[PDB]
Amino acid sequence: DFEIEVMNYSIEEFREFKTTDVESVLPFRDSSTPTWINITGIHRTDVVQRVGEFFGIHPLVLEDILNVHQRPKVEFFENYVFIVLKMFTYDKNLHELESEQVSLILTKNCVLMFQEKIGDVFDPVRERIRYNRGIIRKKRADYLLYSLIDALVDDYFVLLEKIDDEIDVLEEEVLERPEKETVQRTHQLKRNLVELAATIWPLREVLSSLYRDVPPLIEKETVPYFRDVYDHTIQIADTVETFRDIVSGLLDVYLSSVSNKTNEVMKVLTIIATIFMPLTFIAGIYGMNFGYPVVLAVMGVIAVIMVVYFKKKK
Template identity: 55%
Template sequence: MGKMVHVGSRKVGVAPGTLIHIGKKHLTEPKITVIDYNVDNFQELVAENIEEVYPFKDSENVSWINIHGVHQVDLIEKIGIHFGIHSLVLEDIVHTDQRPKVEFFDSYIYIVLKMLQYDKDKEELIAEQVSIILGSNFVISYQEVIEDTFDPVRDRLRSSKGRIRKQGPDYLAYALLDSIVDNYFVMLEKIGENIDALDDELLDKPTPKTLEDIHHLKKELIFLRKFIWPSREVVSSLQREESFFIKESTSIFLKDVYDHIIQVMDTIESYRDILSTMLDLYLSTASNKMNEIMKVLTIIATIFIPLTFIAGIYGMNFEYMPELKWHLGYPVIWALMITVALVMLAYFRKLKWI
């Protein structure tokens, strides 16, 4: 929390629209790729400099400009100026801690979503901000890292599978949104596998590590839910708002994305209920184990109370105690204590305490 406040404080007192990158620097140098296509033609290139993408603003085809790395603010500013993107939007693009949202402008639509990846080493979810600019004949996407879930979209464009090459930029934007949302199911599947493993461990032999893993998964679900709820409003707004940039035929597909988000939300809530039940079960199991231990210790202590009393009496060694000089005194006392112990054990067993 302290680190987040420290990073955000760099913007205190700065004029609105000032571009300051806030977030981790994942790449040394930004990478710009361009895919320009229509039904019959397809062109894909890696731009060496930002000026190479300028002509695609007025291309007769649909152009997808993808920028990996948003830390180089001068590059973001140049492409923003050329494509007529508002400075406040550019500010949000380089500030990678944005909440998922959508904003409608006269010449484009600005969309922010979170793309999730799973770190196998740390066993945790990692969120990457994806900003999308939907224009009349182009889509510009901004990403923080190179690894992403857009490769299936690229493959469909290259092979001309489906309707993507026959549709406009709004359908391309839908395909990107759908890819991000579908990846949520992959993340939930991994969380579900971890929950199943924890469930087996909980029934077999739970340890303090089990409790730690349950809390870790609950935090991940809260982390995931933080991005899913506003994403629902993003897709709902795209579907509901009347915009020149989104055709009615594409709105039907956006409804499908909305339904997928609802499914993700339902799954998250189900997982949260399961983890809450598992937490209660763990605490109940730990409490039962503690009760069993306390019961055994109590029974042992109860048995030794009369034995200690007998040993205390004959340990006083008064001179005129009649049993002190009796040659059978020692074995008789032993027999008495053993008898008392056995009688108490039999009584406890009759009460089903043991």
């Protein structure tokens, strides 16, 4: 798609609007009062670059925003901070997770945004500016950021739940319903997990640096807030390695239960084999073409001395 979404606001009031013309939003640069410019759809290179040239942001940053498959990171410029955030979808049952790159610039009184597509995790931060919630009005553009980063960070929690279900609904199938496609899912989880912690790890660094560095973030006013988040991020980081670990032995768990049935199937063939092997034989030999019930008795006799010998095993 394409769109652009600004949310200027102040302690007293706010205004909001949705345009598709880039020149209607550029004068907010010089707002005294905080703004949030959301640019859905980065695919329009010309929109980005325009915004990118007007604000005074280096080309390589602008090019960064158009490169999609990245680490999450921060970089501190003279008048602006630059951040690179991911934000996941997980379809359940078709066990597959998606990741949309967001990019963010903190200058003057504006929090720039760059979303690949429509549909996003900041529909709570939106409401808090519209209906005068929390301390979101009272404060500045760097708090706005902390609003935006938080809203995203919280999202993971609920993804972290969703998989926590997937694990639980796999260390069952493993040890009770041993099956072909169970193996698939298992690796499918193990993989996705990797992709997760490949993002969350730098994500803690991002927040770890933001907290502990500070330039045009108003210091002893927004930094604990950021720290609160930084705490949130540690938790999760932890919580991935956690699952990672549990999922790893998991495949050997299947293995062990798989083999254990092979065994059972073996015995079955062995005892049925082991008894009707010799009984067919004596039946076969008295087919030699060259007292009747007494052979049947020592058939029965020797048949059941196998039967009480597999009680001593099997």
